[PDB]
Amino acid sequence: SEITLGRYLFERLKQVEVQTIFGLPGDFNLSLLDNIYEVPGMRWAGNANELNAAYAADGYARLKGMSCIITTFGVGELSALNGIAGSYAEHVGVLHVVGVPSVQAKQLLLHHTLGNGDFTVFHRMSSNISETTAMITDINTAPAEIDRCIRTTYVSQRPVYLGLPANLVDLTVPASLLDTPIDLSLKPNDPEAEEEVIENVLQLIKEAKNPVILADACCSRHDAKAETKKLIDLTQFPAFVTPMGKGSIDEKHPRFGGVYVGTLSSPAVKEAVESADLVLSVGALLSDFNTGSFSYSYKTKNIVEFHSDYTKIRSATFPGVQMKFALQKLLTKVADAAKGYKPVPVPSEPEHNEAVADSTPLKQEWVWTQVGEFLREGDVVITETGTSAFGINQTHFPNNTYGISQVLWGSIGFTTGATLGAAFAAEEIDPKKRVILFIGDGSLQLTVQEISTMIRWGLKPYLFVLNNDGYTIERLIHGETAQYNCIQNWQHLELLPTFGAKDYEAVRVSTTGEWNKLTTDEKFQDNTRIRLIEVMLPTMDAPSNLVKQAQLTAATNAKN
Amino acid sequence: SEITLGRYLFERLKQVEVQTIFGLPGDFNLSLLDNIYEVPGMRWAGNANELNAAYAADGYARLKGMSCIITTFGVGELSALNGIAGSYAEHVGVLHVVGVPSVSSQALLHHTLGNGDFTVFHRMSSNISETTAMITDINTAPAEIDRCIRTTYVSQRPVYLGLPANLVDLTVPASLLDTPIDLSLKPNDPEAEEEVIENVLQLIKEAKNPVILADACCSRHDAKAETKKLIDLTQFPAFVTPMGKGSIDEKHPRFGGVYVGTLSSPAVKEAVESADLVLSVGALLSDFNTGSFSYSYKTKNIVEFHSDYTKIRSATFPGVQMKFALQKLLTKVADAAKGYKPVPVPSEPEHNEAVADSTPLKQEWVWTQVGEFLREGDVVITETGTSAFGINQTHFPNNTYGISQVLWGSIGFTTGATLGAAFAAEEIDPKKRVILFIGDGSLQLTVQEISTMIRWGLKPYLFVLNNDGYTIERLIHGETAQYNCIQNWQHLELLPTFGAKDYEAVRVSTTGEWNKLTTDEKFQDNTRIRLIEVMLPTMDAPSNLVKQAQLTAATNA
Ligand SMILES: Cc1ncc(C[n+]2csc(CCOP(=O)(O)OP(=O)(O)O)c2C)c(N)n1
Ligand SMILES: Cc1ncc(C[n+]2csc(CCOP(=O)(O)OP(=O)(O)O)c2C)c(N)n1
Ligand SMILES: [Mg+2]
Ligand SMILES: [Mg+2]
Q1: What residue numbers bound the domain in which A295 lies?
Q2: Together in a domain, A286 and A321
Q3: Which residues make up the binding site for thiamine diphosphate (chain A)?
């Protein structure tokens, strides 16, 4: 009893909960894609381009655990690379399958049209932004090679490149291979290295007078949210998230003290974290840097970083000591270690805006607080590079909120595709889960067509478009009135019906009363159709600590 | 007297006729961009994404001879890579300038892979560049900039120039701008050239059925007049590849149409495949396979004039340059071809038989009818899909500039190329029309670049072929597969949705409707941007594609 290697791919992807496939068809993947329609519960998104496809795969992988995008040799694969790179940078498990010319390599050479002298060139380009690669050449090893690529994607949480020649996808393999699951479990830690790490961490905890816990980008990605909650529970140490970590600590926890954004933190959060004599960083990735926007660092060097891959203690690096296992062992002994601790109180924010007149023009500082009233448990909140990403750091999340904000890679446009991916993933998880996008008017332009694919599948995101007449975040750094910071004015309300939407809402809000009227309405709160909310904001308006920091950078002689 | 390195770049660009700069701003290019406004006459396109900006730079370079796209470190530059690779594949001179971190911050996490390797993106682009520079020394920088510009224009392939943010604000003597960049070619080694010429002349002497074939680099490397003289003096049949269409002015009695290898017409296929010598001008590749056709010749007796070298049968003559070598050949070639006896060459109908105005539009009808609309000086842009194949049957007036990316074949390219070509055209002559045929499927990939056309008040004709999906793909495999289907868009609403105030958007479904629009005197003048949505059956295509589809249906039975 045999199945094609093509069918085998998708049956595997199904076993690991990948149901939606991203990409575009082309010369070398059409017979491959035919298998999707024969695998119960698999679908093909039908993306509007390959870059967006990759962004969407990234968004889907963030919620579901991994994802698969399929492109074609040359034109499709090169179009996806920025998506793939951002997934690599932010540790998101994206399987990138590339249909290539059939396997004296006459067919590859006739089809290979770059006119360089090398048909491996695209593979070699992808290698730079891939955990591993594979180019399948042999039917007899192909099943194992695909299993390895899927396992690696999942376990390492980084992109994997899989080249599938057209002629191999049609060859058959025994169906019975599917009856043995892909091993998705992490390799155990080294008992001796782990034990050393744990002993040192316990000793540092015993010795600290003002320890804090800092959840970062990989806390949730590597399945350590529970472990982290437990760490806060057993220690009672003040707990904070970085902007990439937001949602990884349920924010109603009594010990949750807010988001640490460096010099952009509230004064109290800044003092709370920067006064710490020990930092336990869980899922660390965002570890210390500089940007023309914000200066993230000024703490102690007494840090313990549980990275997914290794652990760092002050200066020492214990390679191969993995976060989740290392945390679990630490939990068996951490209550004792922290037994000597008197609970320093945590920073708090005002929970609501002050009441103002309904006529009041919308401003960002007000908006970001007010979003807190609309959010609910189970929401997915996506924020684009630009003022949105900075603004969301002040917003109060309910319990069980999944944040997506691409703080490290910072590719504007990402979020329209990420919204698509997340919405597919969220519908598979719970049809009641809402996906809420905040995207700038500038960023929207780069990837706007992926709205079309949301309509195509009857997906129901809230698309809050922030209309401030261009690239405000860039205006604040340089060229406040430069033509390169301006954009063509689009009719945002007309986007949905221009892409064929029949069942949608498109509304513009310019005031506090308008915002409230829309967002407190019970019908709007139900995820019943796709909606675009156009939010009219002043061009130089931005979250306050950002504005203050912009005035700082501009005053100082410190530079690049 | 001193100017910034940034200002120097843009002044050097102005001297080589680059007036519009493509790209998107970002973290390490903002101070660079400031310089644009300091240089009289230069402008920043303001593109809607970096992929489209690369597609636009490519269209711009095709018309003006070279272009410049500027992107930001990591996120900008990697978005543009498919645009660059296409310009590499088809020999288009695109300068990709990337604003990078200063050479003393590196010495950031935002937009890097997390490894501290700040060279990974430059190394990625080196694979699809003629050459690269990463500038680190203010003292050598003007020379490195000139080198990159020269190699871009001379080699007609992309060049990658990395510019650290600290370097752009540093100063260089303005006096350097007073000596031009040298863009000239050295003459050929006379020995090698004499050898190529005598060998080609013998081949002509001995050939019974020789043909001329002009490909893309005939135009790119400025061999059009030499190629015309070749046809005049020899009276040999003369064809173009799809990539080279427009390279031979089609009103020449010896022009026999377009050779598309296995997808050529019966008559063209036979005229080329029975040749006992092919004189190829500007071949990109004389051998390649597409998802749609096979391209090759029957004879081993192939002469290839390339920009960089010459090939005769299996022998290569490195450094024997097309233009100089063709000029030398023409002095002797009438004598070599003295015996040749002409004959009619193949042709396609110039006109359609009159039919009823209610006649629904079909592809075969439309591609011939386009010939009635075109005029001398037009730029005619066709997307990968049915359009690229149908245009091959359209008669081009003299001096028609075709853009059709048949070799790289990346759908979506033409939306950007149309922007780039429309800027370049406006710089050449505001009255030169830019005419695009793009499928509904390809439009989706790069649609937002319509916004940038509107922004600059550019006035292209955008013919959108609505056949409800990916028809070329349907004909190959998966006729009714969901992956060949697309979300249906309201094309007539694209222009106003992207902020167009002065535009037309019209839908044509019949022969009569087509004719009322295109014969309208006012329509024929490029007074405003236009979208024309052309309604076509789902499985309709030019008859070569239809024939191929029935061929593999009656077969595989
Ligand atoms: C692909 C890509 N191109 C360019 C940039 C540089 N960039 C960062 S923010 C930004 C402007 C964002 O504008 P908008 O979405 O309108 O945000 P806001 O006005 O709310 O700041 C740009 C161009 C980038 N990060 N990624
Ligand atoms: C960037 C890219 N992605 C995918 C492909 C594969 N491809 C070739 S033609 C085609 C369909 C084009 O459809 P459309 O523009 O509507 O043209 P039609 O054939 O219907 O006239 C596709 C998906 C490609 N060539 N380039
Ligand atoms: Mg904006
Ligand atoms: Mg189509």
Answers
A1: 186-349
A2: yes
A3: 387, 410-412, 442-443, 468-473
